[PDB]
Design a protein around this ligand. Sequence first.
Ligand code: ICS
Ligand code: ICS
Ligand SMILES: [Ca+2]
Ligand SMILES: [Ca+2]
Ligand SMILES: [Mo]
Ligand SMILES: [Mo]
Ligand SMILES: [Mo]
Ligand SMILES: [Mo]
Ligand SMILES: [Mo]
Ligand SMILES: [Mo]
Ligand SMILES: [S]
Ligand SMILES: [S]
Lengths: 522, 522, 477, 477
Amino acid sequence: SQQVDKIKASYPLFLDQDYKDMLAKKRDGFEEKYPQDKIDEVFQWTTTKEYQELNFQREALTVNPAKACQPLGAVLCALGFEKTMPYVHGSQGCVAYFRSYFNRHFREPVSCVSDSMTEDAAVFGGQQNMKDGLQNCKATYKPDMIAVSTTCMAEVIGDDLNAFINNSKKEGFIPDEFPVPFAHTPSFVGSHVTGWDNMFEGIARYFTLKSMDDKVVGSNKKINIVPGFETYLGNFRVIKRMLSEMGVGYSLLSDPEEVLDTPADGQFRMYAGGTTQEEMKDAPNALNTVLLQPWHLEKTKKFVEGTWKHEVPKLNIPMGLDWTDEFLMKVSEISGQPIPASLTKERGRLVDMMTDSHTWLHGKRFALWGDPDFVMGLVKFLLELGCEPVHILCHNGNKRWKKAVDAILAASPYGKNATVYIGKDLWHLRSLVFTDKPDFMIGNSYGKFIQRDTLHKGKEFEVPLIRIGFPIFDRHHLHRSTTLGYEGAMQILTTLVNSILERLDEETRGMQATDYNHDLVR
Amino acid sequence: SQQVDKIKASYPLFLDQDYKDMLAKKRDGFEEKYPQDKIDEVFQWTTTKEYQELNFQREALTVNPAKACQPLGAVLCALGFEKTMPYVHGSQGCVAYFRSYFNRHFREPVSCVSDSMTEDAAVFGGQQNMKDGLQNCKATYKPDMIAVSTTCMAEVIGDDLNAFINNSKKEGFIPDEFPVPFAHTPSFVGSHVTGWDNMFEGIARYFTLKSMDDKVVGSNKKINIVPGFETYLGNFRVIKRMLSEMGVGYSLLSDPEEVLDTPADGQFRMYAGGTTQEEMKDAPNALNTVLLQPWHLEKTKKFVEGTWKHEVPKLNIPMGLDWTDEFLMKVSEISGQPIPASLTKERGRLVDMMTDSHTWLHGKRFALWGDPDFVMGLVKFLLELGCEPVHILCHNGNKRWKKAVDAILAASPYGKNATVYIGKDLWHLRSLVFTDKPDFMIGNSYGKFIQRDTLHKGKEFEVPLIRIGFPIFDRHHLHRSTTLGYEGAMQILTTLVNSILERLDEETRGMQATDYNHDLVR
Amino acid sequence: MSREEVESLIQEVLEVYPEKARKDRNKHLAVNDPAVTQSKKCIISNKKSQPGLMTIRGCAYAGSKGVVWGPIKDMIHISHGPVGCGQYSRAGRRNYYIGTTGVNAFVTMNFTSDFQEKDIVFGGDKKLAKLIDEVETLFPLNKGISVQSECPIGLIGDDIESVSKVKGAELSKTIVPVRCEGFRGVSQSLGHHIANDAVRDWVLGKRDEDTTFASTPYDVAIIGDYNIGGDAWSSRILLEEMGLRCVAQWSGDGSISEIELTPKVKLNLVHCYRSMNYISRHMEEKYGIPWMEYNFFGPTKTIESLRAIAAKFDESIQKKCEEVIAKYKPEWEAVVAKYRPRLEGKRVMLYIGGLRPRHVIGAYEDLGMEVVGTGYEFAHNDDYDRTMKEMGDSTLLYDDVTGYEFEEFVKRIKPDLIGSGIKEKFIFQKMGIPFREMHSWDYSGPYHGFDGFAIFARDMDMTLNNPCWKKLQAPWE
Amino acid sequence: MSREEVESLIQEVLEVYPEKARKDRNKHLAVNDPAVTQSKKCIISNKKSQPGLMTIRGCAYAGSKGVVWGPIKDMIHISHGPVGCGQYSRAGRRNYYIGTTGVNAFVTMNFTSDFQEKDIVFGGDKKLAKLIDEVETLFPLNKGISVQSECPIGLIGDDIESVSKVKGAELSKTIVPVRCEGFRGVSQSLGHHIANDAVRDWVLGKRDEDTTFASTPYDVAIIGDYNIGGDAWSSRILLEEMGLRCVAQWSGDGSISEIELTPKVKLNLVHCYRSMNYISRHMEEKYGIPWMEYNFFGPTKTIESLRAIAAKFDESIQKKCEEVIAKYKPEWEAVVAKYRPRLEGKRVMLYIGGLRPRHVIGAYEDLGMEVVGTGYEFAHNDDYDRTMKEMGDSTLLYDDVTGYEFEEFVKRIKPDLIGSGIKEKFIFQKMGIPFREMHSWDYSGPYHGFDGFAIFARDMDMTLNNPCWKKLQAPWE
Ligand code: ICS
Ligand code: ICS
Ligand SMILES: [Ca+2]
Ligand SMILES: [Ca+2]
Ligand SMILES: [Mo]
Ligand SMILES: [Mo]
Ligand SMILES: [Mo]
Ligand SMILES: [Mo]
Ligand SMILES: [Mo]
Ligand SMILES: [Mo]
Ligand SMILES: [S]
Ligand SMILES: [S]
């Protein structure tokens, strides 16, 4: 039943007695459900160290991964170029998922096409889909460029992308001079960040590989910036903002801010902003190229060093105090521009916030996960804050990356309880937060089910989730935030200390029980 | 007892059994405490409509006010002027409190002196304190200006500030040219916002009243901006940013952002930034003067209109979509500068966030309090979001302001359930959130004790607090936020919708009970 | 618009296409004529998507794992292949259930074999067998395993059916091999069919020789309700208030035991015809069980369905049917009184999957709204046969609409509200057109039944009449 | 530094002042000689603050309402006058209590008569009478009312004593008038004395002819512990582990009945000498109850106090004292073992109110730290008499230090750590100097007793050694 002036949705509608009674009858009548005592017994077992040992012996089963597949990253990279349509050669189910996954994180339209390879293409290859698809895409959505990646179908059957695209031009499906860069993006290699690297390197090759003879390093007086797989709009913006405050001429290569943040003014804009084709063609004339997330830009780095002849600086992701400092100092060194008083003051304001909040942050224990560069920058900043990374998980990390993070931990007394996990998933992480409980998790929305599990054991075992990363689906507009530079460090610091204080307030809200410590001033 | 490797502070130390037993013995032995059943009985009574009726019949008792006293605002206003020392003629206990109260909100030094009037001044007056205080202050802290306000002792005994200052100068305690503007700021009139108005009008009079003959309205082609009592750094910053973005020449009169946000770089800066003396002397040559918080700037308005002859535009506080629109359109009309494409796009990004989040905001019910301009702007924006302000409380509001908010409410179907309360306090509001429960409170840190009370009745009665206003003492760095302009509206929107979604997650976290609605995507 | 004007709109939109795509898309767009019984004379469907045109369709794995199998709560479903598919589909569909997740129920978890290159080159059958052992150890209360094949499985020649037969025999466990690779078929639809055939072949017959279930003449199954936001629960409550016993729910909040009990029911009540008619026809043929289509969207259709269902039983069920109708009459009449004046005359375009584009029309009409265009991602012509009589004369129909087409149709027709999916939502909000998700219900619902109609009405009003839609143009433009 | 270097520092800092202020401030600054017993020959105190020099002191209302009366948990304390005083002092001080706030306890609430101009013009005695009736109706479980006068009360000539007696007789209720107006005295100190006299005159004698209380030979009262972060509780547990019975706590977590029972105890244990010696002397003279000073900061002082307190009772209490010392010995030794190596040799400057600038020295020394400068806002010369022996030779002493002086002293001495108040904290952090709040305990504590020592040590380490202090210089500077 409903009362028309206080309508109930699913929660709390189904807590009404008649719905409760009906669901008990369904269970008892027809579900042949395990007894609740057995369910409790098994749940408790899944919180034990014995279960963790079996859990960590998995060799074939993955449960709740913390990574996605290559063409997702290819599509995000392609979106950063002016009037460019991401095009995934292969089966259309993939593109529905890529679009929906980004739709839910950015709350924006996400334009991407498929060429809808079916059983016929499974037998004969996908050449006809490529010729018709490129012609249909260009006629209908009028992009200035189509950037081609692949689904795993096209990879397994071995479609020759280069031949297919060349034949599309030779047979007149698209004009010979129409730009169609491509990359193979096999989902069974690496992860979504690998797909970003592969797609960028393909676009860079397309516009520069055969035109290097007239290039001269440093002749356009700019610095190239390659952001990598980046899902916070504030991170594109803070980099542009800082470089512009120093008067540093730059070229951001793959820039999807505008198309991921169009205004609601009565018009749908399929394309907006983005790196221009001329910016890519001219990028070898830069002074140098800075990779913002180097641990998934290895293929791009090889091309920029080997063909453009840029002496790519050895820089970490600019997260936290030290690494933002190093980023600005290196940019100052390459460009000749001094670090202006405005950024020096901004830096001191971050340090001020650190002095203000250090007593609440000291010794707090975190479990965290995400992509390799993001995770290592978060680990570094937590150490600067006097916090203790305890469980550091990077499902798509590698052994060299783990060696680098272990060295960062070893250099700080706040890393003494930290372990770095690569190749492990969020079902592994769930055991860790039961057997070696931290204070908080820092992660994406999939962490909410870990928090739910820990609370089921009891309030004193609950590990609350702090949402930083990708994807974030169950909160609105956090994709607008920043995690890089001084600005991103201030936002992370504010979120962390206020998460601590919100949780303390919850624990001290009980009147005449715990509210002796429910202080007005903290 | 303590375990050296896991040291417990008061919470949870005093939950140890030996502490519990000791406190039980203390209570039963010596406290002659009411029985718990009687305590439960009286608590339940304080949640009833019967109690609320008695509560609202109060004429003499105030409980948990939501306002402070005049000199607090005078100090904040004085802090906005270059190398200016706020000086409060009267009792030193006041200045200790003013400094501490701003210390805890901004987490910054707050410089302010007293002249330490003691009991002898009740008979003999405070002139000697003014003579020595002005000389000591100038010599010791080297301000370029001393801005004088009063404590309630000095008001009751009737100290003649003008004569005291003139005698100090005539007798050589301070140079005759040294700027000493003053204002009477009686704590028993109005509230802290009244003190801001009084102090600003005194400074404005000091630099312009006797020099009007050479002034020409519009001759300096700028617009004056008077912010009023403002405790978010982002609010000073967003007005300056939007005006610069338009190319509008302006003068912010009382600008404390720098001195309330100095960097931690190894040196303490007692003064930083601030409106210059030349800017106040030149202010009558502006095209016009805009008042950001007009409902506590009435004395300033009369001076600017009657003496500077500026036709102060009838503008609401620039909060929410409509009133930010009106502000930019009026600045454009006065200055002749068009609204640039960047601001138009920013506006459309706020509208986009509104369309993205409208389904979770719709119909949500709020109790809220604060200063009059802040409160009406929050009411206005809530209506624009499809939210229902239900309990609107302004302890320091007046009947004309109430009439204006009632007219705003009557113009929107979302105002049909709203009542505006003036002269009522947070013990009044506590009754209202029991007898007519909203979804959330929007208020300052004093609201946490109302949330504590509502949870005590039951989890289904808990009204969570969303911290927006002043003072905020129990979270860190929220004073860096913004509530004005499109930027402020984006921040408030994000906090409101994510507060709704955080609470829904808490309510649906119960496994096999409510987590059927614990959605990954919202 | 006149039928001629709608036809000119179709032709003008088609002008952008190359002639091959143009000739094809013309066959999938039509002006409705409600007198037509054979929709194939007006529109064709269930064909390949033309390449590069930005179809909204998914794949057979979506139809099998995401739609039919995924909701079954006490089995573990393996997304078998590389990591992408199971990650994008993890908890994206609101197929609600009661259980202890990770312990006896597993719906919102993502189990996968996370194929790497070694598995592509050498085959994944050995990995799948090891994976099954690890599932059994770490999730001992699972009541069966399904293997949802992603694209590479068939392409590399893996034999998941023999792994399933061998491991299932070894462990005395039900292990269902599903060959739902995304390259199969042309859409989610073939995934439905593959999934019903897997239920048929591996699960449904398990109790064929078991007579221990005491049936009654009032035993029914709810077929094709995936319990989006609780939809099936607010349907089940009415059927049991009317005196029927709902033995099974396929597959929202569904258990493997109630699937195995379904051949014991007396009547299969089919809500989603598209996805479940296959197994409904199978049970008619094998067990003699009749099936009938019904509609619980809005009061008019719900009341008609309750009476149609009750007429198959006896006078006692018909008496309870009329009592249920009498109980809820003041409730939905109050919903109509509040919200119909707010929605009277407003015009909606729909684009959804295989059932809702026709099946919610009555609920809109109960609030005085008009559905001026509708269409489906993957319906067949028997779906369009059922649609044309439900839509008004000279309304627009679109099968497997392209993004370009849908945007252009919307710009000409200018509806007051669009009901579609997540890939469409943010496009049309930016044009200033109120939008409601008609897959996920925009994280609201249920919408089925009388209790769902209240929520549906509230939702269409809060969005269509929201103050935000009057604010998109800056006052200085 | 040497004695001459400190003397030269003092004279250089004084050079900024006009002659009148210079001559005065010179008397309030000294180089310590631990052999001094007559501190008045080297430092004077409890004098007016020089105008305009940014003293850190508060007022007599803070000393009475904020310090002594406000913590009494089951009474309602009216801030009587305008709205400021009670608002700035609401829940600023962490005088912790157990109760149900708003129902039987009221500590963190702000009750005020919120004077407006008509109250100044006509007087507030009528308003006060009506306020009392409203308090009784709306908070019927209060066990007494105090009236804390703010500046205007005596300046306009109101008669709150008459209101208190008349309304008190009318209502059979204890209503205490306190004349703690901020213009009285020079600081928080006189507020203490006024508050003591108000306790003496209106509360303390109520049970003089009541013999129903069951005494024991081991009854004591904790006098002058305001339970900051639970300080009094972690003191009380030790005294009762030593076989004593703590009848009362003045006034942290204190009840009005405890206070009225205090004339029944055998010994008054005075921790804050400054604020409560007055009532302690009264109770000895009137009731024959002796009193003694003690110190629970750090293990050395706590062990010494427990032994000195036990020596006042029989051998059985002395035996339990050594058992208490034996129990906690491994606990505080683990604290020293962990934290003293992290803090050995570090130098601290302190500036606090009237007790802790000397009481916490032993605790710092228990961690190997050296207190190189200390001073008080409002101590008297009997406080400084007690300080000389506690401080090293040639250390710096400052009474009612000005903001300028404290900054200049810190710049020259360069301490590793500063312990002071909220108005000082953010100045010195910007200079790069670790700072600990030694009033509010920086939202931590307790610091009293053995359990408090562990927290104190952890807190000094976490701040002095925090990685943030090595980051204030940008690397390009
Ligand atoms: S199953 Fe089908 S697309 Fe019948 S695949 Fe799809 S939960 Fe749609 S129109 Mo999403 S044939 Fe169900 C459907 Fe309808 S996932 Fe849901 S809303 S009634
Ligand atoms: S009462 Fe006094 S200023 Fe003895 S007014 Fe002050 S809670 Fe200080 S040095 Mo705040 S004489 Fe207590 C004090 Fe000491 S408020 Fe606390 S810390 S031991
Ligand atoms: Ca959006
Ligand atoms: Ca600060
Ligand atoms: Mo057609
Ligand atoms: Mo089978
Ligand atoms: Mo049928
Ligand atoms: Mo001295
Ligand atoms: Mo008295
Ligand atoms: Mo004594
Ligand atoms: S989950
Ligand atoms: S409170």
